[PDB]
């Protein structure tokens, strides 16, 4: 295996600022047929990779002129003149010169932007779920930056532990924000013992925690 | 145009084998060398092998000799990879690709646990999901195995303002995910919002209408 090493592992960049990603191979990628088969991929979470560059320095179709790449032998480079919001994801170099074909570890391009406080939404359980004897309460934190955020569940003002799961999105390709979804899950029996269901959110964009709540039943 | 169309998600038992498909369109299938690639969050992208569909000749990575077998039908313009004696190390996303064009990939989960299709519940727009003339609404896709679920909205005509969250693993070993969209408050009366949930391992295909709750 020809070892493909990328640097840095993560690149944090402001929109409009330059970015450069290095790729180095264990040995030369100059093929005996003259062509140097060094490629650049871009992958977003849950999607196929996209080839951006072939044969070292050639842009593939649709790929904006702000993308350039050169190098030869072992050392290689991908440059973005001015980073746009949609340029985020993991950039992979890989070599098709030597067998077996080998990929770099990836450089993740993350976008820096201004603080944005979350919009906080809460969703009582559906009547369809309650009939099945479970109650899931969903707290949504939409379009915030940076990614770090804290959710606390409060039922009749009592702090909950052990009954919730959350996940955060990948960074948004258009506003470079994150969203988070937390689910509090109780038995229908337990859910019906209490009135006030509250989501309490701490984030850098908020000068104090914001609470979103409903009263169970109240229409 | 140029399009590689791979088979859907699989739950397969340890020790068993699975065969994945990749249909090529928009180029001479028989003339160009088709590659297969394994992707995991622990090992990244690994090259499995390459097949000339015309000749049927194959070159394998040493690491995949015996594990993987590349095949091709010239008739249907379809490449095939059988992966055999499956272990935990074989759960991955598998891609076909050539000339910088990649299939959408196929998630393969190696487990002896049973498939379980999701319950799909609405997250109704309400006064508690409204901000600045907009309403958030969604679907809670609860209690399925294994990953992945696919969620579209209005059969893919709605993409703006959609967040389909990463699945969480519950104590049960089942997954749950939410998909939410933000839409105008003004048109909740005239517009219909349907989440389309596909879970291929359980043959689940659910269309759920989400609307304001009634009282």
């Amino acid at each position: 295996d020809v070892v493909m090493t990328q640097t840095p592992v993560t690149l944090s960049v402001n929109i409009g600022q330059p970015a450069s990603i290095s790729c180095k191979s264990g040995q030369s990628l100059l093929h005996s047929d003259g062509k140097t088969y060094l490629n650049w991929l871009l992958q977003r979470p849950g999607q196929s990779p996209k080839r951006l560059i072939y044969l070292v320095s050639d842009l593939d179709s649709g790929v904006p002129d702000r993308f350039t790449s050169s190098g030869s032998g072992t050392d290689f480079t991908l440059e973005i003149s001015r980073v746009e919001a949609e340029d985020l994801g993991v950039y992979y170099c890989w070599q098709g010169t030597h067998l077996p074909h080998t990929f770099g570890g990836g450089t993740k391009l993350e976008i820096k932007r201004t603080v944005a406080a979350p919009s906080v939404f809460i969703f009582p359980p559906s009547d369809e779920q309650l009939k099945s004897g479970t109650a899931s309460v969903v707290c949504l934190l939409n379009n915030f930056y940076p990614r770090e955020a804290k959710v606390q569940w409060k039922v009749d003002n009592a702090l909950q532990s052990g009954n919730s799961q959350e996940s955060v999105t990948e960074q948004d390709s258009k506003d470079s924000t994150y969203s988070l979804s937390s689910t509090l899950t109780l038995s229908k029996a337990d859910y019906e013992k209490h009135k006030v269901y509250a989501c309490e959110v701490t984030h850098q964009g908020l000068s104090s925690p914001v609470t979103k709540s409903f009263n169970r039943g109240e229409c | 145009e140029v399009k590689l169309q791979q088979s859907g998600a699989e739950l397969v038992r340890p020790g068993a084998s699975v065969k994945l498909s990749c249909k090529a369109l928009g180029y001479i299938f028989t003339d160009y060398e088709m590659h297969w690639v394994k992707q995991t969050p622990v090992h990244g992208l690994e090259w499995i092998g390459v097949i000339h569909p015309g000749s049927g000749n194959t070159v394998y990575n040493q690491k995949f000799q015996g594990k993987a077998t590349l095949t091709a039908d010239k008739s249907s313009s379809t490449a095939y990879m059988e992966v055999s004696s499956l272990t935990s190390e074989d759960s991955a996303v598998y891609y076909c690709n050539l000339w910088g064009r990649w299939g959408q990939g196929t998630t393969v989960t190696v487990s002896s646990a049973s498939t379980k299709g999701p319950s799909v519940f609405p997250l109704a727009p309400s006064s508690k999901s409204t901000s600045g003339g907009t309403a958030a609404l969604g679907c809670l896709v609860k209690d399925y195995f294994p990953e992945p679920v696919t969620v579209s909205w209005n059969s893919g005509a709605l993409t703006s303002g959609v967040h389909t969250f990463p699945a969480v693993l519950q104590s049960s070993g089942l997954y749950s995910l939410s998909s939410v969209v933000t839409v105008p408050s003004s048109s909740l009366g005239t517009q219909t919002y349907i989440c389309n949930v596909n879970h291929k391992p359980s043959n689940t295909k659910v269309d759920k209408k989400v609307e304001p709750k009634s009282c």
């Binding site: - | 140029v2 060398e33 590659h35 050539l98």
Partner: peptide
């Protein structure tokens, strides 16, 4: 009718 402008790897098969 190739899949693109250029291959990602040298022919090998």
């Amino acid at each position: 009718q190739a899949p693109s402008a250029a291959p990602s790897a040298a022919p090998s098969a």
